[PDB]
């Protein structure tokens, strides 16, 4: 069911990036949109988990946007 868990996590992850005002950067939003739309159309879990590492790396690069040390505890 990871196939479906990965597709559902992609919808929640782009909703978090949209709320952090990433749309205010056209050069960066156009990449997040492409990674999101590719994970939904994917058929192999190895493609979807590699595109999920690229999409999650956007959120981790925004230092101080989310308190990750508090969200992991």
């Amino acid at each position: 069911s990871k196939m479906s868990d990965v597709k559902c996590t992609s919808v929640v992850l782009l909703s978090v990036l949209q709320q952090l005002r990433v749309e205010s950067s056209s050069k960066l939003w156009a990449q997040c949109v492409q990674l999101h739309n590719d994970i939904l159309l994917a058929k192999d879990t190895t493609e979807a988990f590699e595109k999920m590492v690229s999409l999650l790396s956007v959120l981790l690069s925004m230092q101080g946007a989310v308190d990750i040390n508090k969200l992991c505890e």
Binding site: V12, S26, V33, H36, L41
Partner: protein, 928 residues
């Protein structure tokens, strides 16, 4: 041995280097297309030819060329007959050589008539191969495209080389035929002048002209007064017409001295009236057409004259500059200040039109005049900045603001509590037949303009007019069931007034504001003004936010309230009559519930013999649709106005509809663009005009299926007579035959039974006739959409069914099942399980993710899920029980939270019926 002396005589007095194309003294055999009408057979069909011996030239260094000598064995009288006709018509440069001679075969003298330096194929083979296109049988078209240097033989190894949408470069490969065809057109006018000045009478047909343009076979002409020569041309130009735009034939009219090697004509930029150029073009190519042409359609006599004259204007309006079309504007004084406003229009189809109620000086403006000025784009476009937008190929007018607007689309919200519940019930396991396929797709700022650019696919398209003027009378027989006409503002019904009024009013309020601000005499005065004047209007493009199985964006046209308010007052009496009728071809207004699905299928199955089921769906129906077919759809709906509107009133309403929902200044991203053609989906008649267009293509496919069948092979004398009468009514009678239109409608309605709803259709048809070519099949639709819609219809979008106990594969995105219900069996509709599960998991608002606020949302989805319980796949049947188990959970949690919040119980315990099957079963049983 003796064949060498014959080969040397076929060369004649000329220098020629001939080689025999078969056995040396017997005739050759070939399969070719012919336009034929005779006492025994009629049609435009492909037949075997056996009366000719063929020779081909080698060049001066031993290689073959497209230059044939074609000899023929004739009787004695006809041999002399053709000779006499040729001698008189000999000095025309449009005529091929005719060598009349004799020679000994089988021990006796036989006459022969040799025609010199012909091409391999004729104009009829080029016309047939582009009309009757089959992607598995292209060998004649491929040899014409290569023999005449349109493309290399390697071009056909490309994926989907023929497809206008996946390989748009094919429009450049077909356009390399343009000068070849335009020379043949010229040579026809030289030949008609020669026949007239020589005193010759006869019908001229595409099979008697080569692909250089030369005429031959004069054995069916007769002599008359030398000044009374008359050439018959109705079927020649009408069969050829759709090929003239496909090959862009008149493209050499744009150049100085009409030479493709010289520069373009620098037209005067202020010029809007081209009436004398349109009349010059008609006499250049169509001199002998024998019907009155009106360059401006305000001068036409009836609907059929408007369709005639607009078909020539779609050809000629390709020569003139794009800046010449659209609103015509004039300077006018209101209380001493100068306004710029529209006082006419110039249409690509209808010509120049001028408004009748123009005032050059005014003291004050009423609310009705402020609405017209506000809607008029003139003031918006004349005060805006110039715009060069390189993101699209569509023509850009002006930018209304100093900044460009970019609109994005966000993802859908995830309803985790329903998904966690479904997974606990065993859903979404790997390898399961049910899985998530419907989602909300995000989009970047270029989304809007990217969807608007698909209007590229709308190409100018000239029709066969002899065919369209018969099809339009059979299409109208499907609408004799309904009443129609104009109504007052007192009688107009509006579904929801809390919706956008358009541009530029969406800045002051919603449709309700205007409907409340204007009394019924301001509304009736605004309607009566449109029967005498053209109001051009701006249309918004709005992106759509909804769930889908494919990632492309969707945009909808926000049509302005001057247009919406007055089109509704003209059409609504008819549109309400189409939705109130039952048992007709058009199924708008019929519910799927309480048996209605079984009633619709028992109606299309009718009393058809050897019946089979099939269906299709138009690709980019709004984008592709030709302007000639969107004009015809409005004329067919307007036929109800004979009692209340004059010929002049019915014109301006048409002109209005063209100025507001066909050719438009679309506003997108805060900037104005000219829309090229096709539907706008916020048009008041959208679903009803789609249904008229869908009947027209299905009537056309049956005219083509029967006229392209060999009449000598038809066994039933009733159908030979039907094919023979159909050719006369189409290509030789010039007025409508009411007795035949009723007979062809009755034939069609027994053997080919339809059910239609916008761009979606189901057909039940006689398979014994369809396999013999006596009615349409899917290959006859592939062919018609190619030359009449500019789209290749992929077999992945079509279907057919042999067993009627299974019903149609898909109609309105719903599958069918035959199931027992009580004492008898019925057809029920069922959805795709991923559409129903996807709508539960993903939502368009954050508050929709708490189920205790939204219990009635799950009750509605369970009504659509109920028929799945009767499916043989247990993974489908479990989807309904998932929804009923969830509705119970939501009521237990709602009751717990209500008691914790107020310490007092809810008194409405009636919710208990929504988690039991009896409430849902009753939605699919008759007698309500």
């Amino acid at each position: 041995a003796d064949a060498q002396s014959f080969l040397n005589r076929v060369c004649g007095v000329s220098a020629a280097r001939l080689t025999p194309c078969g056995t040396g003294t017997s005739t050759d055999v070939v399969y070719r297309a012919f336009d034929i009408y005779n006492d025994k057979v009629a049609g435009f069909a492909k037949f075997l030819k056996t009366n000719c011996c063929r020779f081909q030239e080698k060049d001066e260094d031993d290689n073959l060329i497209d230059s044939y000598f074609v000899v023929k064995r004739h009787t004695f009288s006809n041999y002399q007959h053709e000779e006499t006709i040729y001698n008189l018509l000999k000095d025309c440069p449009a005529v091929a050589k005719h060598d009349f001679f004799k020679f000994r075969i089988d021990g006796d003298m036989v006459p022969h008539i040799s025609r010199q330096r012909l091409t391999k194929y004729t104009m009829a083979d080029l016309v047939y191969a582009l009309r009757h296109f089959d992607e598995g049988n292209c060998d004649t078209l491929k040899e014409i495209l290569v023999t005449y240097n349109c493309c290399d033989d390697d071009y056909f190894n490309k994926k989907d080389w023929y497809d206008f949408v996946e390989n748009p470069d094919i429009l450049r490969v077909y356009a390399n035929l343009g000068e070849r065809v335009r020379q043949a057109l010229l040579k026809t006018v030289q030949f008609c002048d020669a026949m007239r000045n020589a005193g010759i009478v006869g019908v001229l047909t595409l099979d008697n002209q080569d692909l250089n343009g030369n005429w031959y076979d004069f054995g069916d002409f007769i002599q008359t007064t030398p000044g009374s020569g008359v050439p018959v041309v109705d079927s020649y130009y009408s069969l050829l017409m759709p090929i003239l735009t496909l090959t862009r034939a008149l493209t050499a009219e744009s150049h100085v001295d009409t030479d493709l090697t010289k520069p373009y004509i620098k037209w005067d930029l202020l010029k809007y009236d081209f009436t004398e150029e349109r009349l010059k073009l008609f006499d250049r190519y169509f001199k002998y057409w024998d019907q009155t042409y009106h360059p401006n359609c305000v001068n036409c006599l009836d609907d059929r004259c408007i369709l005639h004259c607009a078909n020539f204007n779609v050809l000629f309006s390709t020569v003139f500059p794009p800046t010449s079309f659209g609103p015509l504007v004039r300077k006018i004084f209101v209380d001493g200040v100068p306004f710029v406003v529209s006082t006419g229009y110039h249409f690509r189809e209808l010509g120049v039109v001028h408004n009748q109620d123009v005032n050059l000086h005014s003291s004050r403006l009423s609310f009705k005049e402020l609405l017209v000025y506000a809607a008029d784009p003139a003031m918006h476009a004349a005060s805006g900045n110039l715009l060069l937008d390189k993101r699209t190929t569509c023509f850009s007018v002006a930018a209304l603001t100093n900044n460009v607007a970019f609109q994005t689309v966000k993802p859908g919200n995830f309803n985790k509590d329903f998904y966690d519940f479904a997974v606990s019930k065993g859903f979404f396991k790997e390898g399961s037949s049910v899985e998530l396929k419907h989602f909300f797709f995000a989009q970047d700022g270029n989304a809007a303009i990217s969807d608007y650019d698909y209007y590229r696919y709308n190409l100018p398209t000239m029709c066969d007019i002899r065919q369209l003027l018969f099809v339009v009378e059979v299409v109208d027989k499907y609408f004799d069931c309904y009443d129609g006409g104009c109504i007052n503002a007192n009688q107009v019904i509006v579904n929801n007034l809390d919706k956008s009024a358009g541009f530029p009013f969406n800045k002051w309020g919603k449709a309700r504001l205007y409907y409340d601000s204007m009394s019924y005499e301001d509304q009736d005065a605004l309607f009566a003004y449109t029967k005498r004047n053209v109001i051009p209007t701006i249309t918004q493009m709005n992106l759509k936010y909804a769930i889908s199985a494919k990632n492309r964006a969707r945009t909808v046209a926000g049509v302005s309230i001057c247009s919406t308010m007055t089109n509704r007052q003209f059409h609504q009496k008819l549109l309400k009559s189409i939705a109130a009728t039952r048992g007709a071809t058009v199924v708008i207004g019929t519910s799927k519930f309480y048996g209605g699905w079984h009633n619709m299928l028992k109606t299309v199955y009718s009393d058809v013999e050897n019946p089979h089921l099939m269906g299709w769906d138009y690709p980019k129906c709004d984008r592709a649709m030709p302007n000639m077919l969107r004009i015809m759809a409005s004329l067919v709906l307007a036929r109800k106005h004979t009692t209340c509107c004059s010929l002049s009133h019915r014109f301006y309403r048409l002109a209005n509809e063209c100025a507001q929902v066909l050719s438009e200044m679309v506003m997108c991203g805060g900037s104005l663009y000219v829309k090229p053609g096709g539907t706008s989906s916020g048009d008041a008649t959208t679903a009803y005009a789609n249904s008229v267009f869908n009947i027209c293509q299905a009537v056309t496919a049956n005219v083509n299926a029967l006229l392209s069948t060999d009449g000598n092979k038809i066994a039933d004398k009733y159908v030979r007579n039907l094919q023979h009468r159909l050719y006369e009514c189409l290509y030789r009678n010039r007025d409508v035959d009411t007795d035949f239109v009723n007979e062809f409608y009755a034939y069609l309605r027994k053997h080919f039974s339809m059910m239609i709803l916008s761009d979606d259709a189901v057909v039940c048809f006689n398979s014994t006739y369809a396999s013999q070519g006596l009615v349409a099949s899917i290959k006859n639709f592939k062919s018609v959409l190619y030359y009449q819609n500019n789209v290749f219809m992929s077999e992945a979008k079509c279907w057919t069914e042999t067993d009627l106990t299974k019903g149609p594969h898909e109609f309105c995105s719903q599958h069918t099942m035959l199931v027992k219900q009580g004492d008898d069996y019925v057809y029920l509709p069922y959805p795709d399980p991923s559409r129903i599960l996807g709508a539960g998991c993903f939502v368009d608002d954050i508050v929709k993710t708490d189920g205790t606020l939204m219990i009635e949302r799950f009750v509605s989805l369970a009504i659509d899920a109920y028929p799945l319980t009767k499916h043989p796949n247990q993974e489908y049947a479990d989807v309904f029980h998932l929804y009923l188990q969830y509705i119970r959970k939501l009521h237990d949690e709602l009751t717990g939270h209500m008691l914790d919040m107020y310490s007092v119980m809810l008194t409405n315990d009636n919710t208990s019926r929504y988690w039991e099957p009896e409430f849902y079963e009753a939605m699919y049983t008759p007698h309500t």
